[PDB]
Structure 1
């Protein structure tokens, strides 16, 4: 099964960080550890080093040479490279989320209370097609710059 995981500012702006949220990074790690992660080449270059404890699959029509990750050229190849696993995590960026959304059955979202200047957005999804099965709000604190709300949604309908 395919899931997307993303952190969204107001207006669904995503980035590679205008905010400083170690709690969100802990949420990201907890929910991706021991699962393959699929990302586009822009996201890969922004991370710079393979995420530990996860198979790192990079979707790009023009692969790099880095032997530390697995390079694939299509959504279908990305999925095949993951093989028989319970859950595949798609970690962005904008275009990769857009291509994978139709195949996804679960969303892990962090809704951040920040207005920011970026131009890359998380895909449009029809809220009526999803059910909110978890939500938790957290205030900002000495370690986290903004307030945020974790949410998990499960797909109920497809169009």
Structure 2
């Protein structure tokens, strides 16, 4: 099973200048809980944005060019990325925009954080078709002293 996990600001913005400009510790904690002990697939730009391997997860990087760091696994196609995960229950695709586009048709589950923040960005989450997806979990949180925007955790499963 393939799942996508992402945090979206208004208008599906996910990034600007290879960064995420907001800071929502509660959402990073949600990301860690839902990815720990699973393989994570990311594109090369997202690998450069994170800047280090994510501990406790098999890190698989898509790039058309040879890898430059043996602490992670480098693959050259979507099919190779999936195969490199082995026989696991759930593969987590962690972006970015181009990678989400390619895996969305293959995904059964979406873990989405909707952030009430207006962000100029240059990268968006794919338009998906709402009729294809059932919301099975949602949890709203107001802003607090640690998290400066309100946010909604949602899990959707392909119908």
Kindly indicate whether the alpha-carbon contact (under 8 Å) linking 1:40 and 1:96 is maintained by their aligned counterparts in 2: yes
Q: For residue 64 of structure 1, report the CA deviation from its aligned partner.
A: 2.9
Once the two structures are superposed, residues 39-84 of structure 1 have per-residue CA deviations (whole angstroms, 9 ceiling, x without a partner) of 0000001111100000000011113310100000000000000010
Once the two structures are superposed, residues 65-116 of structure 1 have per-residue CA deviations (whole angstroms, 9 ceiling, x without a partner) of 1010000000000000001000000000000000000000000000000011
Kindly indicate whether the alpha-carbon contact (under 8 Å) linking 1:20 and 1:146 is maintained by their aligned counterparts in 2: no
Gaps of 5+ in 1: none
Runs of 4+ in 1 over 3 A off after TM superposition: none
Matched, 1:20 2:23: yes
Instruction: Provide the C-alpha distance between the structure 2 equivalents of 1:141 and 1:116, rounded to a whole number of angstroms.
Output: 19
TM-score, normalised on structure 2?
0.96
Deviates more, 1:63-72 or 1:35-44: 63-72
Instruction: Provide the C-alpha distance between the structure 2 equivalents of 1:147 and 1:20, rounded to a whole number of angstroms.
Output: 12
Q: For residue 34 of structure 1, report the CA deviation from its aligned partner.
A: 0.2
Instruction: Provide the C-alpha distance between the structure 2 equivalents of 1:139 and 1:5, rounded to a whole number of angstroms.
Output: 21
Once the two structures are superposed, residues 12-46 of structure 1 have per-residue CA deviations (whole angstroms, 9 ceiling, x without a partner) of 00027332100000000000000000000000011
Instruction: Provide the C-alpha distance between the structure 1 equivalents of 2:109 and 2:86, rounded to a whole number of angstroms.
Output: 18
Instruction: Provide the C-alpha distance between the structure 2 equivalents of 1:48 and 1:19, rounded to a whole number of angstroms.
Output: 17
Tell me the SS of whatever aligns to 2:119: coil
Tell me the SS of whatever aligns to 2:15: coil
Matched, 1:48 2:51: yes
Q: For residue 119 of structure 1, report the CA deviation from its aligned partner.
A: 1.6
Instruction: Provide the C-alpha distance between the structure 2 equivalents of 1:69 and 1:50, rounded to a whole number of angstroms.
Output: 7
TM-score, normalised on structure 1?
0.96
Kindly indicate whether the alpha-carbon contact (under 8 Å) linking 1:3 and 1:105 is maintained by their aligned counterparts in 2: yes
C-alpha root-mean-square deviation of aligned residues, in Å? 0.9
Tell me the SS of whatever aligns to 1:3: strand
